[PDB]
Design an enzyme around this catalytic site. Sequence first.
Site, PDB file in Angstrom:
ATOM      1  N   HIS A  16       0.762  -1.235   0.000  1.00  0.00           N
ATOM      2  CA  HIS A  16       0.000   0.000   0.000  1.00  0.00           C
ATOM      3  C   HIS A  16       0.795   1.288   0.000  1.00  0.00           C
ATOM      4  CE1 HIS A  16      -3.759  -2.088   0.406  1.00  0.00           C
ATOM      5  NE2 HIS A  16      -3.378  -2.654   1.535  1.00  0.00           N
ATOM      6  N   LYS A  39      -4.427 -10.221  -7.949  1.00  0.00           N
ATOM      7  CA  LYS A  39      -5.275  -9.528  -6.993  1.00  0.00           C
ATOM      8  C   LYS A  39      -6.278  -8.685  -7.766  1.00  0.00           C
ATOM      9  CE  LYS A  39      -4.991  -6.863  -2.651  1.00  0.00           C
ATOM     10  NZ  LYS A  39      -4.230  -5.922  -1.787  1.00  0.00           N
ATOM     11  N   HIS A  40      -7.529  -8.686  -7.323  1.00  0.00           N
ATOM     12  CA  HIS A  40      -8.554  -8.018  -8.119  1.00  0.00           C
ATOM     13  C   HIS A  40      -8.517  -6.504  -7.981  1.00  0.00           C
ATOM     14  CE1 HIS A  40     -11.296 -11.795  -8.505  1.00  0.00           C
ATOM     15  NE2 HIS A  40     -10.022 -12.059  -8.732  1.00  0.00           N
ATOM     16  N   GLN A  41      -8.049  -5.990  -6.856  1.00  0.00           N
ATOM     17  CA  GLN A  41      -8.023  -4.560  -6.607  1.00  0.00           C
ATOM     18  C   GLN A  41      -6.883  -4.279  -5.649  1.00  0.00           C
ATOM     19  OE1 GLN A  41      -8.508  -2.729  -3.537  1.00  0.00           O
ATOM     20  NE2 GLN A  41      -8.476  -0.742  -4.586  1.00  0.00           N
ATOM     21  N   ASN A  42      -6.288  -3.085  -5.768  1.00  0.00           N
ATOM     22  CA  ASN A  42      -5.345  -2.647  -4.767  1.00  0.00           C
ATOM     23  C   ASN A  42      -5.255  -1.131  -4.781  1.00  0.00           C
ATOM     24  OD1 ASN A  42      -3.427  -3.374  -2.647  1.00  0.00           O
ATOM     25  ND2 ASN A  42      -1.962  -2.338  -3.964  1.00  0.00           N
ATOM     26  N   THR A  43      -5.198  -0.547  -3.587  1.00  0.00           N
ATOM     27  CA  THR A  43      -5.043   0.899  -3.416  1.00  0.00           C
ATOM     28  C   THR A  43      -3.612   1.180  -2.997  1.00  0.00           C
ATOM     29  OG1 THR A  43      -7.312   1.052  -2.612  1.00  0.00           O
ATOM     30  CG2 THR A  43      -5.842   2.964  -2.193  1.00  0.00           C
ATOM     31  N   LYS A  64     -13.551  -1.599  10.633  1.00  0.00           N
ATOM     32  CA  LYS A  64     -14.598  -2.433  10.058  1.00  0.00           C
ATOM     33  C   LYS A  64     -14.773  -3.738  10.815  1.00  0.00           C
ATOM     34  CE  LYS A  64     -14.632  -0.641   5.383  1.00  0.00           C
ATOM     35  NZ  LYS A  64     -13.820  -0.493   4.144  1.00  0.00           N
ATOM     36  N   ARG A  83      -7.501  -1.721 -10.615  1.00  0.00           N
ATOM     37  CA  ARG A  83      -8.603  -2.678 -10.704  1.00  0.00           C
ATOM     38  C   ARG A  83      -8.309  -3.664 -11.843  1.00  0.00           C
ATOM     39  NH1 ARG A  83     -12.314  -5.429  -7.477  1.00  0.00           N
ATOM     40  NH2 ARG A  83     -14.334  -4.351  -7.205  1.00  0.00           N
ATOM     41  N   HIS A 123      -2.922  -2.505   8.249  1.00  0.00           N
ATOM     42  CA  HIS A 123      -4.082  -2.807   7.403  1.00  0.00           C
ATOM     43  C   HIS A 123      -4.712  -1.500   6.923  1.00  0.00           C
ATOM     44  CE1 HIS A 123      -7.665  -4.824   5.888  1.00  0.00           C
ATOM     45  NE2 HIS A 123      -8.429  -4.065   6.648  1.00  0.00           N
TER      46      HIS A 123
HETATM   47 ZN   LIG Z   1     -13.490  -8.933  -8.105  1.00  0.00          ZN
END
Ligand SMILES: [Zn+2]
Length: 128
Positions: A16, A39-43, A64, A83, A123
Amino acid sequence: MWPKRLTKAHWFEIQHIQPSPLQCNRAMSGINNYTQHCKHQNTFLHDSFQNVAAVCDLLSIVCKNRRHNCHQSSKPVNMTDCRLTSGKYPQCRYSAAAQYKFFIVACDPPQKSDPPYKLVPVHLDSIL
Ligand SMILES: [Zn+2]
Ligand SMILES: [Cl-]
Ligand code: NA
Ligand code: NA
Ligand code: NA
């Protein structure tokens, strides 16, 4: 080759904390190799580790997961949201979208192998 036995905080940094400009396909390749999947998404937060770690010293708030070891950034930061758009692993390809948002990190006391701050980020809880 990334170390094979990372602390939670070190993995947070790898996943990150990266500077911009950065290209998602290139920036994701190490992460994906490590986890053996696309990985489907990462910021990516475009701030230094030191600055992000300083957020841990701010007021603690609920996460959360209902713990109370989260901390909100005092200002927004530039970030890139990668994405997954195509490819079979390991040929993973991404779209990028810039954002300028606050973030919330969970922080823990450092593990022995971590830099010896009071707390380290472990996290990316939220962007908001
Ligand atoms: Zn996905
Ligand atoms: Cl950075
Ligand atoms: Na060991
Ligand atoms: Na940076
Ligand atoms: Na705060």
